[PDB]
Design a protein around this ligand. Structure first.
Ligand SMILES: CCCCCCCCCCCCCCCCCC(=O)OC[C@H](COP(=O)([O-])OCC[N+](C)(C)C)OC(=O)CCCCCCCCCCCCCCCCC
Ligand SMILES: CCCCCCCCCCCCCCCCCC(=O)OC[C@H](COP(=O)([O-])OCC[N+](C)(C)C)OC(=O)CCCCCCCCCCCCCCCCC
Length: 456
């Protein structure tokens, strides 16, 4: 099925992911435990004894450079190159009754760590997966700076008996940490991505992955369902999502393709739940106005109203007749709302007497922006078109209600609607990230959302 939303992370985005990762990887690397090395010796002109290098602690583990390359159709390749591991510890040697002790410094440089990241999807939950398929460290030199006392044999000893085991265990510990951090911390983090985002008492958005993440030459492509759903009653959309093929760029870190299907499912869900309705009472209009929802006022042009229903208030019911459409094109987004406006006369017992039913429809601009990690918008209308559907007070020129419709609608109706639109809809962002410096480029059948991300 064509996805309703597509997320494309660019190289700039991956570079950021790697910098945050490496930084987080440094801490785990600095917590590696290297054993104590105690062994005996017997040198031709020195004698027999027991040496010991122990109580070693990692003081600095700098990872200056890190990089994530994209291996088309395969995955990511994480690489660190000039790793510097500065270790410190103590040592003690004993020759007969001679006891010698002191601290020592060790420096491991030119360490290279390479790891393969494989991306997948979990169908039963719709969450992305990431695991480390391969890892390999590599140490170039080991500078044992016990340069403080004339004890060359001990330094010779370190290189001839200990170095070969230290490096091997260091290379294993590093890849052990990397592999673990991926499964235990990288994967669980990217699963904070919203799958079933509940936005209110009525709707929610389904951001579930509909296929495994595809790695290309220059982008990591993520396909999401992107359809507003209802929990009170499930109903599939009478349309299919468009193929969102957009220019892969590297100006921003991430790019979202928000299809028209996505936006239109919202309209369907809110309509069918019977919530796009509103009651206008005469007391909502500020007391200092020309128009009044009273039969008296309506008497100026429709009496009838004042003739059958003498001096009473008027109540108007505004409801959506059909699901509001939203068209996305390179010029901008257009909204097509159709409403049923029915006027009732409020009898002295609070009962409602149907006056007439009006069919209104218009065309407006839907502007879209982003605040925090939300998608907000604002609706603006054009001329309103009235149509008379049925009248209990006889046929009349439906054009007489134009002035009333042109006050009520933009003063009473539009305001409430824009409040929800300005509240917005949650975007598919993982935890602890905020989107800044965004660009919204309208395209044919979908909206392009580009942005930079900042990880807390
Ligand atoms: C696709 C979603 C659309 C929404 C827009 C956001 C899209 C994401 C684009 C990247 C920008 C966001 C950066 C996220 C940072 C990644 C995790 C992090 O910083 O620390 C993890 C966490 C870091 O730990 P921690 O700091 O988060 O919390 C742990 C704290 N301690 C350690 C004390 C317990 O776990 C790790 O292991 C860090 C990375 C180690 C291995 C390095 C691997 C290379 C880097 C990974 C980048 C590849 C990701 C590919 C994404 C594709 C999947 C959709
Ligand atoms: C983020 C950018 C915009 C993209 C999404 C926009 C595409 C469609 C998704 C929005 C729903 C479609 C209708 C517009 C907004 C309706 C409010 C909503 O989203 O949830 C209902 C909200 C939120 O649900 P609630 O539970 O918070 O309440 O509840 C309301 O009462 C709002 C309805 C407005 C009152 C009645 C208005 C008449 C119906 C027509 C509305 C649209 C035209 C405006 C009037 C024009 C007259 C000619």
């Amino acid at each position: 099925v064509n996805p309703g939303v597509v997320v494309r992370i660019s190289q700039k985005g991956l570079d950021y992911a790697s910098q945050q990762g490496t930084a987080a990887l440094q801490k785990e690397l600095k917590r590696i435990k290297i054993p104590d090395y105690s062994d005996s010796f017997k040198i031709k002109h020195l004698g027999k004894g027991h040496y010991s290098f122990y109580s070693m602690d990692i003081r600095e583990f700098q990872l200056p450079s890190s990089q994530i390359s994209m291996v088309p159709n395969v995955g990511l390749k994480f690489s660190i190159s000039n790793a510097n591991i500065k270790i410190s510890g103590k040592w003690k040697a004993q020759k007969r009754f001679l006891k010698m002790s002191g601290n020592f410094d060790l420096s491991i440089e030119g360490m290279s760590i390479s790891a393969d990241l494989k991306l997948g999807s979990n169908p039963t939950s719709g969450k992305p997966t990431i695991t480390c398929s391969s890892c390999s460290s590599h140490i170039n030199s080991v500078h044992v700076h016990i340069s403080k006392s004339k004890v060359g044999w001990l330094i010779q000893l370190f290189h001839k008996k200990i170095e070969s085991a230290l490096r091997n265990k260091m290379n294993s510990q590093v890849c052990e940490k990397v592999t673990n951090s991926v499964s235990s911390k990288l994967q669980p983090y990217f699963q904070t991505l919203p799958v079933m985002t509940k936005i209110d008492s009525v709707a929610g958005i389904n951001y579930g992955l509909v296929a495994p993440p595809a790695t290309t030459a220059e982008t990591l492509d993520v396909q999401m369902k992107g359809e507003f759903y209802s929990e009170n009653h499930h109903n599939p959309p009478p349309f299919a999502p468009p193929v969102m093929e957009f220019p892969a760029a590297h100006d921003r870190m991430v790019y979202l393709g928000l299809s028209d299907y996505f936006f239109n499912t919202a309209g369907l869900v809110y309509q069918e739940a019977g919530v796009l309705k509103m009651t206008l009472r005469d007391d909502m209009i500020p007391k200092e106005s020309k128009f009044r929802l009273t039969t008296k006022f309506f008497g100026t042009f429709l009496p009838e109203v004042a003739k059958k229903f003498p001096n009473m208030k008027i109540q108007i019911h505004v409801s959506a007749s059909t699901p509001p459409h939203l068209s996305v094109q390179p010029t901008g987004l257009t909204f097509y709302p159709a409403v049923d406006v029915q006027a009732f006369a409020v009898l002295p017992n609070s009962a409602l007497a149907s006056l007439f039913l009006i069919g209104m429809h218009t065309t407006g601009s839907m502007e879209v922006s982003a605040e925090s990690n939300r998608l907000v918008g604002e609706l603006k209308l054009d001329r309103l078109l009235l149509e008379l559907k049925h009248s209990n007070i006889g046929p009349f020129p439906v054009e007489l209600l134009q002035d009333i419709m042109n006050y009520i609608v933009p003063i009473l109706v539009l305001p409430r609607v824009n409040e929800k639109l300005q509240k917005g809809f949650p975007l598919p962002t993982p935890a602890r990230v905020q989107l800044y410096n965004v660009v919204l480029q309208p395209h044919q059948n979908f909206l392009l959302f580009g942005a930079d991300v900042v990880y807390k």
